[PDB]
Design a protein around this ligand. Structure first.
Ligand code: ATP
Ligand code: ATP
Ligand code: ZN
Ligand code: ZN
Lengths: 96, 184, 362, 145, 48
């Protein structure tokens, strides 16, 4: 059971993105697309750094997007996290 | 940040490409410190946000303990978790990790002998093997084997490899002796 | 003369390289024959000497011929290895060092860790003139030239790599070539590259498979002094048979965890030995004669040896071997001691080992 | 033929009970666990035989004095004076013993080869009794899975 | 086998709806779509 759990964790993290949850093949339609998406666009370390920066930044100096995310995080609403959508999918036709 | 935003929001622009090449050096310098995420904006659209990642934050994130904590958190959230509370558990882990990295940054304020012995043994034993040919004194042997015989031919052929296997045995014995001397 | 001997040498090398594997199988077959002959010795009555007893009377000459043949085949298996498998190792090493030199600058920008035997030994081959002897890319020294010449100094990179600027200038300039003969043996001795052959010999000596074959040959040679040294050659079946390798993979897959399980067992047994030595020292008499008692736990080392040997090998635990605690003021404590020993050591840990093997299979 | 020979000797009818494997499919499902990895099961026994032969070599060359198997001091029943006899002892009694060959050979207490013999017995118990039998069981369980 | 059966049950109920049988990704094209569909529209307790 321990081995199966480890294998399941590896398979999930290799086949679907942690944040949006879109499968790897959709990004893989572009070469190295899944790696690019999971290491540049939807990196969880990047979200952690964003929360760190937003917390350590003064509230008066917040931009519009930072203020939006700050209010949502204070109210504990996680709708700002992309779920089922991404920049590529939202601008599919114009980007390509 | 301005140039990256323009490049990502205007992908196919030859005019912007030249400016990207001109600013290649600055972008390369600031690549580690540039953060990029995607959020569900107020206009019901996906928007990319660019911020600043600190060098201290990057180092404390790449510290091994934080990596082990990340692996444990991923294991837990994958094996026992739900789609509803996934993004809540992730934020709790992010907050705890941020506090621990800040505390770590706050507190953080300000065998070779065996390899050498093996190298020496390998050099010495092989030099002993090559001395017969480096001295260039094989002329007497060549004088005795002017008489060309297939049997002498084959005997010398086998003798070369036999000398190699004595040289390897001698090297191995020297390595064992050196290891025993080092440990004792 | 020179051409004839070179051709005959090449024929011998080709033959040995072709027949390397057949000779390796033959060595195993001869090892099984010798060890089957060895199974019929007798100890004869001081000075005791090992004789081969048999009704036929031939199998002693059989044993001598077989031992000589095994030694010859063992030597030929080393020769065939050196002719066949060594060039692949040299090709791989030269490829690795060349790629490290070009795309990492392991001898220009940064330096080896001084703890890497390969990295330290590979410094010699760079200066040699016969570099990529086996690797196809013969322009690696020019690629390093064109990559690091301007930054780190063209003449300095040239000194590192062994190229000679004056040699290239002399080649480009005008001179008068003078004929030479390969027949000149002094000239061929000057022509051979001593440093490159030294580096090659070092790589071969550091090769693991060549070391195994040397051990095989040494074992075969010692077999003449003592015929039972031929039994070590039966350890070659693991490499001989892939199907046996599949079986052994079950053990070797989790070898580190198998060793750690034994370490944990040793610690648990040491703790039990501490408890027994401090509290249950009176139940470890091991002599039937009442006159002389053979106390086995009066010494800590002796008690630990007892617990690790007899208690571990016992099917029921240490209580199967120590005195009955019936009618004693420490009866309950000793019974708990024995039950916990049996449960934790005999049942659980051995089950851990078996589970490790089964998990490796799965 | 077995049935015909049963008339001459009535116990020849016992061989017909070997037909249950073909008679019952449910018993065939059980037997498939053994037969699925039969080649590896035989190779495991071969490896065990080689390991026991190596242990017999070591005991015959170094620990020959601890293999007396007679209680009467007048006549000693040495079992490792002969290589074949020592191998038979190790393959039969040592293998079938629950603790290894040390459960059957003399105690090495107070001997100049005590440590070497104790290592011998412990390694025998670990490699033969524990690991290889576990390999067989793991083969059967793997066949089931 | 018991563990595998439990895991299979969990995977099936997490990846496809009990009533219609449509996969989770199709509903997940809308955020929280699978949970909304399996807890408001096609809930088996609602049918009961
Ligand atoms: N949102 C995400 N953020 C980061 N990685 C993701 C995400 N979604 C999927 N992945 C995948 O998870 C994997 C992350 O790899 P991993 O966690 O082993 O990185 P690491 O820091 O190199 O780890 P290690 O400590 O083993 O060196 C990659 O295969 C990546 O594609
Ligand atoms: N038609 C369906 N009706 C209900 N749940 C469905 C249906 N199809 C799929 N599901 C999924 O089955 C799961 C139901 O969860 P579960 O049965 O554990 O609920 P519960 O009442 O909270 O249970 P528990 O007794 O463990 O607390 C959810 O993940 C849900 O998405
Ligand atoms: Zn994503
Ligand atoms: Zn439905």
């Amino acid at each position: 059971e321990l081995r199966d759990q480890q294998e399941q964790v590896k398979e999930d993290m290799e086949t679907k993105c942690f944040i949006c949850g879109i499968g790897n093949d959709y990004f893989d339609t572009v070469p190295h697309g899944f790696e690019t998406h999971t290491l540049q666009e939807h990196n969880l370390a990047n979200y952690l750094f964003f929360l760190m920066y937003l917390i350590n930044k003064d509230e008066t100096e917040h931009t519009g997007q930072e203020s939006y995310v700050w209010k949502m995080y204070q109210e504990r609403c996680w709708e700002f996290f992309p779920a089922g959508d991404c920049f590529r999918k939202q601008y599919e036709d114009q980007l390509n | 940040v301005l140039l990256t935003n323009l490049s990502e929001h205007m992908p196919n622009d030859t005019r912007l490409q030249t400016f990207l090449e001109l600013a290649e050096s600055v972008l390369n310098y600031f690549q580690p410190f540039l953060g990029r995420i995607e959020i569900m904006g107020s206009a019901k659209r996906i928007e990319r946000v660019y911020f600043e990642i600190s060098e201290s934050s990057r180092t404390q994130w790449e510290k091994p303990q934080v990596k082990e904590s990340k692996r444990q958190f991923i294991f837990d959230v994958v094996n026992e978790g739900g789609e509803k509370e996934k993004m809540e558990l992730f934020v709790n882990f992010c907050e705890d990790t941020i506090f621990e990295m800040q505390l770590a940054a706050q507190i953080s304020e300000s065998s070779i002998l065996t390899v050498r012995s093996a190298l020496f043994a390998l050099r010495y034993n092989i030099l002993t093997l090559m001395r017969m040919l480096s001295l260039k004194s094989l002329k007497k042997q060549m004088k005795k084997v002017k008489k060309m015989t297939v049997k002498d031919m084959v005997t010398a052929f086998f003798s070369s490899y036999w000398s190699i296997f004595m040289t390897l045995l001698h090297f191995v014995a020297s390595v064992f002796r050196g290891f025993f001397r080092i440990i004792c | 003369f020179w051409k004839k001997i070179i051709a005959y040498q090449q024929k011998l090398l080709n033959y040995f390289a072709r027949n390397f594997y057949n000779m390796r199988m033959l060595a195993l077959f001869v090892a099984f024959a010798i060890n089957f002959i060895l199974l019929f010795y007798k100890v004869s009555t001081i000075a005791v000497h090992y004789v081969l007893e048999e009704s036929s009377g031939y199998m002693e000459p059989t044993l001598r011929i077989l031992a000589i043949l095994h030694t010859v085949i063992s030597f030929f298996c080393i020769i065939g290895y050196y002719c066949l498998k060594v060039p692949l190792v040299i090709f791989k090493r030269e490829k690795e060092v060349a790629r490290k030199l070009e795309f990492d600058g392991l001898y220009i920008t940064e330096q080896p860790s001084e703890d890497d035997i390969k990295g330290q030994w590979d410094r010699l081959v760079i200066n040699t003139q016969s570099f990529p002897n086996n690797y196809w890319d013969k322009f690696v020294k020019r690629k390093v030239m064109d990559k690091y010449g301007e930054f780190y100094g063209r003449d300095r990179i040239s000194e590192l790599l062994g190229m000679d600027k004056a040699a290239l200038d002399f080649s480009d300039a005008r001179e008068k070539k003078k004929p030479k003969k390969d027949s000149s043996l002094s000239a061929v001795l000057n022509s051979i590259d001593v440093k490159y052959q030294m580096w090659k010999l070092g790589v071969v000596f550091t090769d693991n498979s060549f070391l195994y074959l040397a051990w095989y040959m040494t074992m075969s040679v010692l077999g003449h002094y003592n015929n039972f040294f031929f039994a070590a050659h039966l350890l070659d079946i693991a490499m001989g048979f892939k199907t046996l390798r599949t079986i052994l993979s079950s053990v070797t897959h989790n070898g580190k965890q198998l060793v750690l399980t034994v370490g944990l067992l040793a610690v648990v047994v040491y703790l039990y030995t501490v408890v027994a030595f401090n509290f249950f020292r009176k139940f470890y008499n091991k002599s039937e004669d009442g006159d002389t008692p053979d106390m086995k736990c009066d010494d800590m080392l002796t008690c630990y040896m007892f617990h690790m040997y007899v208690g571990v090998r016992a099917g029921g635990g240490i209580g199967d071997e120590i005195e009955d605690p019936a009618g004693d003021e420490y009866e309950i404590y000793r019974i708990i001691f024995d039950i916990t020993f049996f449960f934790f050591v005999i049942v659980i840990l051995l089950a851990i080992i078996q589970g490790l093997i089964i998990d490796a299979f799965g």
